[PDB]
Design a protein around this ligand. Structure first.
Ligand SMILES: O=c1oc2ccccc2c(O)c1[C@@H]1C[C@H](c2ccc(-c3ccc(Br)cc3)cc2)Cc2ccccc21
Ligand SMILES: CCCCCCCC/C=C\CCCCCCCC(=O)OC[C@H](O)CO
Length: 380
């Protein structure tokens, strides 16, 4: 498109936002530059009116997708640049799960040589004690609380594993030892932990032999697994999530095997064992949700009725208590001008945002670096 010529260099950016969230009025001004050749944005935003009444992370998506890097084989699908310099109107509804909603209307267009994004934001139905108005979101932390749920699951698993280790040793030292989980008759955790399936899962010896250092009491692996699940729950990185997921998958396989041993080999309804299986299913589901979460591609489709595009996507904001706050985004873009625009095939934008602080800035502010690449259409 002709608009493309406006983005091959470095372009100055002005962002102006007037907002009202549950009657708390505020204004933001941002300035910086966009480098669409590298899909890169660098901006600093200031709350001009005082303290921002919502967390800065919740405004990132509202505060110029014309600066996305569209690979060359996708140049025909870049609506945003094709609508320039005349610009486009961008409207969103952002639904914060179990909380309020933002509605935004922005005009994005060139004024002289500056790409200007002017935005009106209305927020309603937010909870004063919630994560948004209550300022409970992490700004950019790389480590934090694991959350009450993960903590309960992992400490319970760890405590049970430690007790199983203790039980195995005590029963090895006294045939008449009775554990708290020795309920009687057909329920003896002592017998379970003392069986060959209680060491190396009854499998290690058959691959690594019985001498191996990996042929440890199951509860040792349990201690390690629950401790690492909790510690990885303190990390805010993709790789910690993938590790949690893979280890949960292993724990799933092992739990099903051990349950089979319980019911068809040992004939023992081991309540503490079943409890660890339930904890393992819980952690499996948590790591599954985690891996899903925060991928956050912006899914774009053409809206021929408005000569524009629509998009939808999910943002996950880390909460200081270790939980996550979903922000479900619905988006529409319509050209301001009457000249031709590109209507794309289905695709998505992959976005990475880095939030930081200006050590010399005393006003409430956010420094933002952003990298966005178009994808979702195979180059073949
Ligand atoms: O101890 C046991 O003896 C048995 C002998 C016969 C039949 C059943 C069992 C039994 O049900 C287990 C489970 C094994 C569990 C555990 C949980 C997770 C992992 C683990 C997960 C992922 C990765 Br990666 C590595 C290890 C290992 C063990 C730890 C544990 C702790 C207390 C009580 C029971 C158990
Ligand atoms: C050996 C039986 C194994 C039979 C298999 C499944 C159900 C068994 C339930 C066995 C009793 C556990 C119930 C319990 O949780 O606490 C004990 C009390 O009897 C409260 O019913």
């Amino acid at each position: 498109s002709k608009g493309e010529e406006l983005f091959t260099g470095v372009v100055p950016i002005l962002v102006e936002l007037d907002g009202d969230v549950n009657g708390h009025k505020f204004s933001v001004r941002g300035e910086g530059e966009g480098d669409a050749t590298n899909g890169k944005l660098t901006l600093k935003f200031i709350c001009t009116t005082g303290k921002l009444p919502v967390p800065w992370p919740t405004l990132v998506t509202t505060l110029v997708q014309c600066f996305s890097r569209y690979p060359d084989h996708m140049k025909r699908h870049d609506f945003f640049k094709s609508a320039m310099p005349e610009g486009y109107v961008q409207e969103r509804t952002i639904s914060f799960k179990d909380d309020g909603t933002y509605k935004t209307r922005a005009e994005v267009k060139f004024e002289g040589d500056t790409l200007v994004n002017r935005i009106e934001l209305k927020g309603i139905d937010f909870k004063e004690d919630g994560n948004i108005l209550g300022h409970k979101l992490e700004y950019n932390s790389t480590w934090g609380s694991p959350g009450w749920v993960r903590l309960a699951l992992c400490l319970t698993g760890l405590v049970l594993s430690l007790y199983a280790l203790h039980v195995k040793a005590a029963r090895a030292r006294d045939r008449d030892y009775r554990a708290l989980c020795d309920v009687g008759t057909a329920i003896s955790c002592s017998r379970v932990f003392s069986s060959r399936w209680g060491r190396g899962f009854g499998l290690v010896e058959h691959v690594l032999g019985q001498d191996s250092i990996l042929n440890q009491s199951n509860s040792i692996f349990g201690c390690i697994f629950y401790t690492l699940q909790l510690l990885l729950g303190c990390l805010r990185t993709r790789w910690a999530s993938v590790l949690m997921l893979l280890s949960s998958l292993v724990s799933l396989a092992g739990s099903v095997y051990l349950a089979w041993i319980l019911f068809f080999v040992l004939y023992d309804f081991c309540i503490v064992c079943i409890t660890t299986y339930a904890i393992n299913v819980s952690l499996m589901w948590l790591s599954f949700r985690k891996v899903q979460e925060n991928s956050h591609n912006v899914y774009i489709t053409a809206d021929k009725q408005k000569n524009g595009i629509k998009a939808n996507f999910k943002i996950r904001h880390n909460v200081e208590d270790g939980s996550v706050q979903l922000a479900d985004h619905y988006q529409q873009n319509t050209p301001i001008g009457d000249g031709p625009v590109l209507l794309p095939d289905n695709h998505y934008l992959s976005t990475q945002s880095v939030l930081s602080k200006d050590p010399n800035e005393k006003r409430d502010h956010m420094v933002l670096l952003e990298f966005v690449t178009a994808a979702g259409i195979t180059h073949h």
